[PDB]
């Protein structure tokens, strides 16, 4: 009696031709499980900003005085609409361009470049209520130029970058609301703010205008930035309205990653792929957790499950008509294999090797790399943002189809592999016994001679032979 | 007396390919490529486009007198525009951040024009300024929605003007800066020389100076008019200050959106049909995974594929009058005379001939084929995309990115689609082959000794087999008091 | 006897279920061979710049004098950091766009538009050490440095109505001094401007004087901009100081736009439909792995080392349990076909291939290979793009994209082989099993079915009777016992 396996499972798979097919064993290849924690990345923590925007951090807004500030990070954590940036109303040129820069960094380090002390001939105590530190008229920590007395000589300030690393320098211009607030502030009138490097050349003038009030002020500050190379000097020259640096940022990077909008908090675990909902210690080719991962991640997919069949049709008591065919049922009373007698370890190991290989081919072929996914855009980059979105929308489709289908096409194939293995085991046995048995038709052979147990192992050996001279 | 196994054949000439063969006539087939529109442009999800005809978005908003009698709905889903509309900036000039402005307006949950800075309140300045370029029936005019502030008398007092946005929606606002050809034209129009046009909101700041210059004449003029725009927030004020050269807004636009869509470059006209997917040639009412109508869709569309046909086989090999060597194998032919199923019996008898389909397996197989077709169709995720994008003369790189991309998806989809058919087709045929082979076998292990197996899928009974005994064979009930002859 | 073919092959394929499976024949469908040469593309040369940048070329840096300069090109060859560019320190507005534009050109032509000589009242021979020609201060061949004449600098005016019948590339520049003093020395006037206007252009520039680091000897800089002047359209220059004027223009007609190949090599007069920085690819296969930065009509770039499709059967010197099953071995001695017969006889032994099925199967395998190759659509793409320091986001989009197509194509390609390979082997297995069956239902009783794919006749079988079995003509007066 040849037969096949059947257990207490009720896992269901789908094949190209049938669905809701109950199978003995099955493997899922859709990661759908995070862990709600935010982690280091390949050993390197994010940059946690709580409720500071990169802008408020670098400028040194009084409200970011106490922030983590790790010297090296893999990505950045930032709350969707942080609240704490330019406490002095204004704006920031090429902002996003800069955030994609600081998203990931090999080494960061503040340094003093244009000391507050050295701008004699110029007031430096300038400040604003809006940038007040506990009922005190302060200002941006890292910034610094008003008239001293009734005079405003030109301002010159310079810095040959000797720090052995490229440096991020930030500066700005004051836009008053009034020609009276102008002379009351810089005495002169047709004023400019000039910067210069080996690769940068910029001459902004202020733009005076009536404006609505914000954090108390009708006036704004407009900041810009740049990347002074090593051994390159920068230059400043202004006849009024220059907000100067005092500090630069020695920045050595890296690989460039991306920012993660998130509420949570670093938790001191470890992952290779991190999502807004949590990390994902996984090895599957696909996942459906959240679109906005950072790291080396499986491919996002619009499924709920991708169940692969590994075992056979579970039939307690096809394409080759043996399983659920002429062998009408599975034996729940066979446990040491998938096919056997009344198990056969030759074919079982073969088909165990078979399925294993399959499940490996699906997985180990899926090449994956460190992407960032979530990008940063401004109000005049909607077009650009959508473009990104059409693409990720577009690979979403391509991957979801190849995956729903891969599974259905390989599931009907796996079901046939088994059918055919049971079919060939019944055939291996047919052409050993031959005349010495009645072939019943349920996959059973009745012995026309007397068959003891040694005679039973020979048939399992493939050794039956064959001194029968009986009707 | 005898019984024969066989399969179906019909008058079909439909051809499929498979991985191994080509031009293979089959009994049935489903093509899964959409290639039919209705040549009509329609509402999208129940919502009309914005029909501009030969107006540009710029001409529309500024109120070029040539756009006076336009449709103007309160809410639209996409925008219809010709390829080079003509009626735009009747007065030569330009429009900052124009492309962004259209992606913005490309879809709108609600639009509304509202007078914010009444033309009349600008005392001290002349306001009736107009031009031949913006001619209305011979008479010099100007943009319906703008105000040309010029000197009054010999005087141009500093011009101030506010609007606190109370409208309860975000408001689109536009303005312009006039650029003369001539210090003389500049003194004539504004009297003052060192002029500026300042504009500020809560997040805006922009002091513009007029760029006077000699330039070629356009529509009659060397001067130009440079427009910019902004979104004023709720409860936010906008401030205009000018000592000369300001083209002020008389109106604003309450705008609430929505989800953002795109602009369909066409010649046609809305026709009051309905659709979930629109193309420039016509709308697509379809349910298939792939289409090849036109690359520039808007809506929820099938994947665009560079194929002429995608015929999936549903029936068997048509062989009138494989992997399991049954169909086209030892059963050499199909029975055009067996019409109630895919696989069945013959049976010859001294009570008569007659075909008969094995209904059990014909059903098993119909279900399975239905599922295959549905698998190919139903696993196809489809989202709302606009496809056609808008780009400037200095964005040829950025344009060519969008192209290289939509191009790459053309290649993926086409390969996969074409291959997906060939594969599932070599499988469809084997499926039917196996189905037959197994019917044959079921009968063979029933009759065994009591018949001669001819080898053409036929069984010659050694004993007499009446109709009741024939049915037992189809039943699976053959059993089994036979003996003769031998 | 029924049997199948075996040969001295050691080629291995994988399939979904097995690996390292020696087969009789195989086709690898991955292109991985160039010719190490850079070539014309569809019959049209690149533009060879050597160590010149596009900027250095157009402005006419004296160090770019003796360049190739063809009238029509298909792509552009440039080193990675050319050196010969803006010999006079400065910059170039919208530079990257300008190169995508010039990256392919149906027709180019330099034409003198504002003859250097006509600028009376201004000094014109202005030059510099930075743009040195053999010790002597010079300047861009294609530009004109308008400086004061005497102690006077009259307002400078200049037009060109574009009659050339083609669109014309025009460039100019604004000088930026270090010093109000250098500014009075060179132009005498202080509140200066450089105005330029066409039918769609407008741009009044002011010179940004400033203290800056010295470069090539200078703190001053020269900022260049450009435009496309239309047919029958005029361009107007107006300056009260600081204009670097064009003496020449460029008639340009294009075409289709291509891209720039960053290489060290040099054009070699071969031909190709597909060029890579390592060499050109004359190929016909769907996938390749040579180098990601192609230009032309290329196979899909795939991160694989090999893609071996199986064409023949399992080499044995399956799913239907025939090959490597009850027919335990292959016959290295059967060379005229994939599957055939043995036949032992008192007239002799001898192999023989069943030609009918060997042919059926060859056709089917040919088609498989062609299906994999011929359904692959392929368009002209440039792949390598051009980006500025403030476009790192935009650059990283292009990358994340070409990266995603790397993943898709690699997966599909690798898997596509493994699948069609577990099928190719079954195909052959079935082909055999069925040959065996055809013979078994012919002989039936008249032989003993050994079970190794062999048949022992109970009767005498001569050569004519053997052929009847191969024919399908066995029939059938036997008896014996
Ligand atoms: C350097 C300096 O002058 N700091 C002042 C500051 C500046 O004058 C102001 O930021 C210019 O833009 O003004 C501060 O007062 C703000 C307050 O001043 C009143 O005059 C005005 O009527 C109020 O509306 C409001 O603007 C400031 O905090 O910014 C004081 C600071 O010392
Ligand atoms: C408000 C106003 O002054 N409108 C004038 C207009 C302006 O002077 C012009 O738009 C300034 O840019 O001039 C109009 O005349 C056009 C015509 O004027 C001649 O003097 C000149 O020789 C011509 O080249 C041409 O500009 C106009 O239509 O623009 C009349 C209009 O009333
Ligand atoms: C038209 C002209 O004046 N050409 C000069 C050139 C320019 O004046 C200079 O670029 C102004 O920006 O100066 C040249 O000399 C450069 C050299 O001059 C020394 O006086 C100075 O102290 C040095 O630092 C250095 O700039 C030049 O080659 O650029 C000479 C040229 O004839």
Q: What is the 3-state secondary structure (H, E, C) of chain C?
A: CEEEECCCCCEEECCCCCCCEEECCEEECEECCCCCCEEEECCCCCEECCCECHHHHHHCCHHHCCCCCCCCECCEEECCCCCECCCCCEEECCHHHHHHHHCCECEEEEEECCCHHHCCCEECECCEEEEEECCEEECCCCEEECEEECCECCCEEEEEECCCCCCEEEEEEEEECCCHHHHHHHHCCCCCCEEEECCCCCEEECCCCCCCCCECCECCEEEEEEEEECCCCEEEEEECCCEEEECEEEEEECCCCCCEEECCCCEEEEEECEEECCEECCCCCCEECCCCCCEECCCEECCCCCCEEECCCECCCCCCCCECCCECCCECCCCCCCEEECCCCCCCCCCEECHHHHHHHHHHHHHHHHHHHHCCCCCCECCCCCCCCCCHHHHHHHHHHHHHHHHHHHHHHHHHHHHHHHHHHHHHHHHHHHHHHHHHHHHHHHEEECCCCCEEECCCCCHHHHHHHHHCCCCCCCCCC
In this complex, the residue of C215, C397, C406 whose CB is nearest that of residue A198 is: C215
Q: Where in chain C is the domain with CATH 3.90.209.20?
A: 45-265
Rounded CA separation B158/A32 (Å): 65
In this complex, the residue of A19, A394, A439 whose CB is nearest that of residue B409 is: A394
CATH of domain C45-265: 3.90.209.20
State which fold the A45-264 domain adopts.
Hemagglutinin (Ha1 Chain); Chain: A; domain 1 (3.90.209)
- Residue in the block written with tokens 């019943």: A440
Cα–ligand 3 centroid distance for A293 (angstroms): 55
Solved how?
X-ray
Residue B304, class by beta-carbon neighbours within 10 Å (0-12 exposed, 13-18 middle, 19+ buried)? buried
* Ligand 2 binding pocket includes B229 (Cβ within 6 Å): no
Whole-angstrom Cα Rg for chain B? 38
Rounded CA separation C156/C359 (Å): 85
CA neighbor of C74 nearest in space, from C260, C249, C252: C260
Q: What angle do CA A115, A117, A122 make, to 5 degrees?
A: 110
CA neighbor of C473 nearest in space, from C434, C438, C430: C438
Atom of ligand 2 minimally distant from the CA of B180: 12
Whole-angstrom Cα Rg for chain A? 37
Cα–ligand 3 centroid distance for C217 (angstroms): 9
Q: Do A88 and A114 meet the contact criterion of CB atoms below 8 Å apart?
A: no
- Residue in the block written with tokens 């407008």: C202
Return the exposure string of B202-222: e unless at least 16 CB atoms fall within 10 Å of the residue's CB, then b.
bbbbbbbbbbbbbbbebeebb
Q: List chains adjacent to chain A, taking adjacency as at least 3 C-beta pairs closer than 8 Å.
A: B, C
What 8-state DSSP symbol labels residue B383?
-
Asked if C404's CB is within 8 angstroms of A388's CB, the reply is no
CA neighbor of A339 nearest in space, from A328, A327, A348: A348
Mutational pocket test of ligand 2: of B132, B179, B190, the residue with most ligand atoms within 8 Å of the beta carbon: B132
Cα–ligand 1 centroid distance for A127 (angstroms): 8
Q: Which residues pair with C13 in a beta bridge?
A: C21
Atom of ligand 3 minimally distant from the CA of C130: 28
Q: Do C450 and C458 meet the contact criterion of CB atoms below 8 Å apart?
A: no
Q: Which residues contact C223 (CB under 8 A, 6 or more apart)?
A: A201, C90, C91, C92, C93, C173, C174, C176, C205
Rounded CA separation A58/A226 (Å): 13
Coil, strand or helix at A264:
coil
What 8-state DSSP symbol labels residue A217?
B
- The widest CA-to-CA distance across chain B, in whole angstroms, is 131
Rounded CA separation C151/B228 (Å): 42
Q: Which two tokens stand for residue C189?
A: 């006037």
Q: Which two tokens stand for residue C445?
A: 């009783």
Asked if B382's CB is within 8 angstroms of A393's CB, the reply is no
Q: Which two tokens stand for residue A202?
A: 């910029």
Q: Do A142 and A59 meet the contact criterion of CB atoms below 8 Å apart?
A: yes
Q: List chains adjacent to chain B, taking adjacency as at least 3 C-beta pairs closer than 8 Å.
A: A, C
Cis peptide bond upstream of A235, omega within 30: no
How many CA atoms within 13 Å lie on the side-chain side of B86?
A: 4
Rounded CA separation B113/B102 (Å): 17
CATH of domain B48-268: 3.90.209.20
- For residue B194, the distance in angstroms to the closest alpha carbon of chain C comes to 13
Q: Which residues pair with B283 in a beta bridge?
A: B278
Rounded CA separation B379/A404 (Å): 6
In this complex, the residue of C96, C377, C427 whose CB is nearest that of residue B411 is: C377
CA dihedral A345, A350, A351, A356 (to 10 degrees): 120
Q: Do C218 and C177 meet the contact criterion of CB atoms below 8 Å apart?
A: no
How many CA atoms within 13 Å lie on the side-chain side of C17?
A: 22
* Closest residue, chain C, to A432 (C-alpha): C451
Rounded CA separation B411/B393 (Å): 28
Q: Which residues contact B400 (CB under 8 A, 6 or more apart)?
A: C100, C257, C382, C385
Rounded CA separation C424/A283 (Å): 30
Mutational pocket test of ligand 3: of C122, C217, C219, C243, the residue with most ligand atoms within 8 Å of the beta carbon: C217
Residue A402, class by beta-carbon neighbours within 10 Å (0-12 exposed, 13-18 middle, 19+ buried)? buried
What are the chain B neighbours of C202 within 8 Å (beta carbons)?
94, 179, 211, 213, 215, 224, 226
Rounded CA separation C229/C250 (Å): 10
Q: Which two tokens stand for residue C308?
A: 């071996």
- Residue in the block written with tokens 């039918």: C199
- In this structure, chain A runs to a length of 471
- SS3 percent helix, strand, coil of chain B, rounded to 5, is 25, 30, 45
Q: What is each CA distance from C376 to A187, B408, C379, in whole angstroms?
A: 72, 12, 10
* Ligand 2 binding pocket includes B222 (Cβ within 6 Å): no
Q: Give counts: helices (H), strands (E), chain A.
A: 6, 31
Q: Where in chain A is the domain with CATH 3.90.20.10?
A: 1-44+265-471
Q: How many CB atoms lie within 10 A of CB B323?
A: 26
Q: Which two tokens stand for residue B393?
A: 């003369």
CA neighbor of A99 nearest in space, from A257, A272, A210, A282: A257
Rounded CA separation B276/B274 (Å): 7
Q: Which two tokens stand for residue C86?
A: 């803006």
Rounded CA separation A200/C322 (Å): 76
Q: Tell me the torsion sign for CA atoms A53, A57, A59, A60.
A: positive
Q: Where in chain B is the domain with CATH 3.90.20.10?
A: 1-47+269-486
CATH number for B1-47+269-486: choose from 3.40.50.300, 3.40.50.1970, 2.40.170.20, 3.90.20.10: 3.90.20.10
Q: Which residues contact A424 (CB under 8 A, 6 or more apart)?
A: A347, C321, C325
Return the exposure string of A73-91: e unless at least 16 CB atoms fall within 10 Å of the residue's CB, then b.
bbbbbbbeebebbbbbbbb
Cis peptide bond upstream of C481, omega within 30: yes
Q: How far apart, in Å, do the first and last CA atoms of chain A sit? A: 21
Rounded CA separation A145/A129 (Å): 17
Tell me the H-state helices in B383-460: 396-447
Q: What angle do CA B339, B342, C368 make, to 5 degrees?
A: 135
Rounded CA separation B476/B459 (Å): 15
Q: Where in chain A is the domain with CATH 3.90.209.20?
A: 45-264
CATH of domain C1-44+266-481: 3.90.20.10
Rounded CA separation B25/A384 (Å): 49
Coil, strand or helix at A212:
coil
Q: Which two tokens stand for residue B224?
A: 């130009």
* Ligand 2 binding pocket includes B148 (Cβ within 6 Å): yes
The breaks in chain C (C to N more than 2.5 Å) occur after: 317
CA neighbor of B385 nearest in space, from B479, B467, B301: B301
Rounded CA separation C397/A387 (Å): 9
Rounded CA separation C174/C156 (Å): 14
CA neighbor of B44 nearest in space, from B77, B90, B12, B82: B77
CA neighbor of C186 nearest in space, from C218, C239, C154, C149: C149
Residue nearest to atom 1 of ligand 1 (CA): A126
CATH of domain A1-44+265-471: 3.90.20.10
Q: Which two tokens stand for residue C339?
A: 């599957």
- Residue in the block written with tokens 């996969």: B416
- Residue in the block written with tokens 């990283």: C396
Return the exposure string of B73-91: e unless at least 16 CB atoms fall within 10 Å of the residue's CB, then b.
eeebbbbbbbeebebbbbb
Rounded CA separation B77/B43 (Å): 8
Q: Which two tokens stand for residue C152?
A: 């006077």
Atom of ligand 1 minimally distant from the CA of A219: 12
Rounded CA separation A378/A397 (Å): 27
* Closest residue, chain A, to C398 (C-alpha): A388
* Closest residue, chain B, to C157 (C-alpha): B214
- For residue B140, the distance in angstroms to the closest alpha carbon of chain A comes to 33
CA neighbor of B58 nearest in space, from B145, B149, B163, B147: B145
- Residue in the block written with tokens 């006039």: B178
Q: Do A263 and A247 meet the contact criterion of CB atoms below 8 Å apart?
A: no
Rounded CA separation A368/A284 (Å): 11
Rounded CA separation C323/C292 (Å): 41
Asked if A371's CB is within 8 angstroms of C403's CB, the reply is yes
CA neighbor of B275 nearest in space, from B245, B237, B301, B249: B301
Q: Which two tokens stand for residue A293?
A: 């991962």
Cis peptide bond upstream of A434, omega within 30: no
Cα–ligand 2 centroid distance for B131 (angstroms): 6
Q: Do B203 and B165 meet the contact criterion of CB atoms below 8 Å apart?
A: no
Q: Where in chain B is the domain with CATH 3.90.209.20?
A: 48-268
Rounded CA separation B343/B27 (Å): 13
CA neighbor of B403 nearest in space, from C75, C103, C385: C385
Rounded CA separation A94/C391 (Å): 10
Rounded CA separation C316/C91 (Å): 70
């Amino acid at each position: 009696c040849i037969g096949y396996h059947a257990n207490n499972s009720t896992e269901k798979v789908d094949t190209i031709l049938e669905r809701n097919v109950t199978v003995t064993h099955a493997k899922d290849i859709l990661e759908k499980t995070h862990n709600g924690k935010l982690c280091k990345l390949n050993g390197i923590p994010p940059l946690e900003l709580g409720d500071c925007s990169i802008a408020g951090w670098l400028l040194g807004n009084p409200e970011c005085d106490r922030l983590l500030s790790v010297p090296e990070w893999s990505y950045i954590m930032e709350k969707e609409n942080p609240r704490d940036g330019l406490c002095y109303p204004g704006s920031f040129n090429d902002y996003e361009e800069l955030k994609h820069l600081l998203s990931s960094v090999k080494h960061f380090e503040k340094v003093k470049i244009l000391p507050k002390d050295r701008w004699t001939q110029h007031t430096t105590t300038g400040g604003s209520q809006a940038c007040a530190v506990s009922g005190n008229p302060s200002f941006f920590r890292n910034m610094v130029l008003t008239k001293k007395g009734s005079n405003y000589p030109v301002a010159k300030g310079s810095y040959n970058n000797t720090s052995g690393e490229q440096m991020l320098i930030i500066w700005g211009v004051h836009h008053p609301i009034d020609e009276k607030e102008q002379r009351t502030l810089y005495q002169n009138v047709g004023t400019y703010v000039s910067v210069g490097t080996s690769t940068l050349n910029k001459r902004s003038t202020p733009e005076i205008a009536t404006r609505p009030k914000v954090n108390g002020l009708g006036s704004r500050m407009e900041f810009s930035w740049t990347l002074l190379d090593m051994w390159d000097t920068i230059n400043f020259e202004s006849t009024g309205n220059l907000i100067a640096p005092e500090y630069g940022f020695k920045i050595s990077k890296r690989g460039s990653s991306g920012i993660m909008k998130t509420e949570g908090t670093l938790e001191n675990c470890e992952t290779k792929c991190q999502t807004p909902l949590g990390a994902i210690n996984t090895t599957l080719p696909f996942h459906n957790v959240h679109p906005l991962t950072i790291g080396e991640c499986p491919k996002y997919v619009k499924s709920e499950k991708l169940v692969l069949a590994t075992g056979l049709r579970n039939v307690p008591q096809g394409l080759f008509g043996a399983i659920a065919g002429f062998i009408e049922g599975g034996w729940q009373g066979m446990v040491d294999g998938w096919y056997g007698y009344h198990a056969d370890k030759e074919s079982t190991q073969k088909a165990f090797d078979g399925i294993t290989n399959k499940v490996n081919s699906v997985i180990e072929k899926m090449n994956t790399q460190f992407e960032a996914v979530g990008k940063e855009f401004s109000n005049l980059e909607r077009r650009l943002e959508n473009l990104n979105k059409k693409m990720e929308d577009g690979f979403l489709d391509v991957w979801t189809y190849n995956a729903e289908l891969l599974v259905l096409m390989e599931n009907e194939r796996t079901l046939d592999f088994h059918d055919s293995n049971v079919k060939n085991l019944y055939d291996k046995v047919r052409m050993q016994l031959r005349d010495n048995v009645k072939e019943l038709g349920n996959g059973c052979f009745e012995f026309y001679h007397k068959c003891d147990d040694e005679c039973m192992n020979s048939v399992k050996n493939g050794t039956y032979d064959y001194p029968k001279y009986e009707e």
